[PDB]
Symmetry: D2
């Protein structure tokens, strides 16, 4: 009678570390991500490499990689495939968004459209899919990953930070609206995290001297670890804390405080 | 050498009262709005009605009513016709949005698409159209109307309140990004205002019993008047205050405090 | 039968400019401040120089300068003397606080005691004195000046900015608690204002070298003027806007956005 | 053999006992400040004697303190001195503060005003001035200050209590950001609607099922929080597993403060 957790974009970012700790905590897993080995773009840990490790921890695993999570059909199909394999959905970690920066007056209609599809549509369709089975069960926990820029939309990041703020707003209303059914929905927004996504976007991957300058912008003078982020994320998904919902938690070393 | 102020949706809501006071402060006016007389939907004070009154106050008027302000082409066309008649743009008041409410799980793709086009696209394209001339002149003031729900997006107002929070987010980044050019951009969000839009949406029109119940939800126990709102709004557009930018102001009788 | 406005610390900061425009708007005035001519510390415009100008604007004036506004007795006696002369109290502007900075671990018990007395006690006793007559009249407007550091208490400003935040919190509850009696209470917090107080605290006197460094810290690249602040302050005290209460407005050229 | 040390105040009630139990499971030695006496004394939910026995089976040494005034500089300085004398190190500190008062704003007296400042602010000011120097000198430390969820939404009938709580949160933000460069963290947690005697009697929900249900109906998640839950979240900010958050305030009230 093991509980089931869903994690998306799990071939990178916090997915791999989160899966390990959720398996240690007694969960079966459903991992959505990119197919192929490490050479393919956006693949930090392939499906194959993870399955061996997670099985030793005692978790059954299902993989999904042929859905478009910016649409209703992609998210509905993902949850349908979850329920037929395991027949339940206790927790869900929805990783969303795509980074874009630049002057506000240089932004194009394509950039504006891409920001809306990844920062808002993924959240809207994602939540409309995971909530029904949780409401029907009378219990559930969801974490939506947005961005720390949503708490302080700054110049040169207007359309990206601005839409992240709207995503946090949606999570507040949704987390409050379904609380009476025993369901929790919260948001986490990170920045200055140590992984390829942030390193490339901040032009820090090339020069170690530029890395040090970027670290000097964080109050705690370092970049975050995925093991740290997974421990925090799991705390909102493992059933140990059922008294927080509709809230946004900043995770950027004090940058967003 | 009168300055020029642009007001959109000016055939209703705050437009008419704002135009009158702005004319008293020595402004020329460009009014976007809806064509037709009082019997057509969405018109509270027709163009013809305001022309005669605005004339005695000493202001010239240009009307625009054949443009789609959810598009880039529409907003660009609007500003081109402003610069053509008067050759300058000193202040801009952009009214945006369209209300939708209901359970989060009942929302359709059409509702989701409609709220994005009115609450976000109007803001994106609107600002990309009014700023370039202000930056060129080295001075400008802009007010974007969003909604008090952006400050506290609640159950039954998930997608409307959440996207309003994103609009406020964009206005913060933009307001701070163009401040060094002497331009100001701020947002105002209202609720419980006495005008047809809110009265119908709350099912309070023609129902004195319902009206009293609605007013009892407001800390100050009343509905707001357009004369009050126009005075506050004109204060951010008449040149008297030039030390605020990128900020959001709640105007709901304490409801959003 | 003119209305009566009360203004404290009125021999400096926003007092004199606020009294001038409030008189233009038809108010009788009661001014609390420091006695003496420009020689004494903390007096920018003496009582004598002002009463002649304000009388030409058509207002009666009452002066008070022998009360300790960190105590219940001082504030109670101030309002008692106001009702004795005019029998009426319509608006009140309570200027509070005294600035302290430095490392948190270098703060002494006297510094801690002083920030509490000027940032908090003044607000507690001030509001307990002005509200009773406004409640009994069924109408009233109050503005409490705190500081923009209350919105973002930063390092080296711990106990000052921290206590300013507590003052804003008190204004929120009080502003919401008495809204049903037709009374309004809001707060304004400034920074980077052009007046002797702020200039001395930032070592920017007759030294354009550092004042240019200070001005670059503001998004709008300038310092605010009391005529600007006076216009915003008067808007919340002249009866033109009765739909905002329990709110905090930042006025630092975008520094606090 | 080289166990880290954690300080917990007001540990005879509220979250102290449960937090002590899990921090011991995670390998900490403990210094517990609290009230002397058994369960018959007011303010003692779990007595010192009863905790030392259970904490012992978990492999933790314990020091107790109950003769200091934590509203003063002398009390807090004395407390930290006795920590370093016994263990020679301070790794984590959980400072419980404050005292409840409610009622109409215009009915508040000078004694009530003086009381909230001493418990909601002075405890925080003097508390942090005593726990930080050891952590800065070592280059590592974690601190949690318990304030109140009302600090995030100071409401009518809670003016001076909620307002001063918002001030404590502001102080925690500046301090948390000011010492981040030294490798030290300071954050705040603010609760409401917790299942323990302090809240049950302040809300008159004790012994009355119907009133207990009406109180729960004010919580979005329609329940009261347990100390096991709160101690799990609190320990996660004091056990070295998360070192990337500082100067922040976290609401813990079932969504009430969201």
């Amino acid at each position: 009678n093991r509980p089931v957790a869903l994690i998306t974009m799990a071939t990178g970012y916090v997915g791999p570390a989160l899966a390990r700790t959720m398996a240690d905590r007694g969960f079966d897993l459903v991992l959505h991500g990119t197919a192929g080995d490490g050479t393919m773009v956006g693949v930090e840990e392939s499906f194959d490499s993870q399955i061996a490790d997670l099985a030793k921890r005692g978790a059954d695993v299902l993989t999904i990689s042929d859905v478009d999570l910016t649409t209703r059909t992609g998210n509905q199909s993902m949850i349908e495939r979850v329920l037929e394999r395991f027949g339940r959905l206790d927790s869900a970690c929805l990783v969303t968004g795509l980074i874009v920066t630049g002057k506000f007056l240089d932004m194009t209609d394509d950039q504006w459209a891409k920001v809306k599809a990844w920062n808002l549509d993924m959240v809207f369709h994602g939540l409309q899919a995971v909530l029904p089975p949780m409401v029907a069960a009378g219990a559930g926990q969801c974490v939506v990953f947005t961005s720390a820029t949503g708490g302080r939309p700054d110049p040169m990041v207007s359309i990206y930070g601005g839409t992240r703020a709207g995503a946090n707003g949606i999570v507040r209303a949704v987390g409050l609206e379904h609380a009476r059914h025993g369901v929790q929905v919260n948001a986490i927004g990170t920045n200055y995290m140590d992984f390829p996504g942030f390193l490339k976007a901040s032009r820090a991957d090339g020069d170690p001297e530029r890395r040090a300058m970027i670290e000097a912008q964080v109050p705690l003078r370092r970049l975050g670890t995925m093991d740290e982020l997974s421990s925090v994320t799991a705390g909102l998904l493992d059933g140990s804390n059922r008294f927080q919902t509709g809230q946004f938690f900043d995770f950027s070393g004090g940058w967003g405080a």
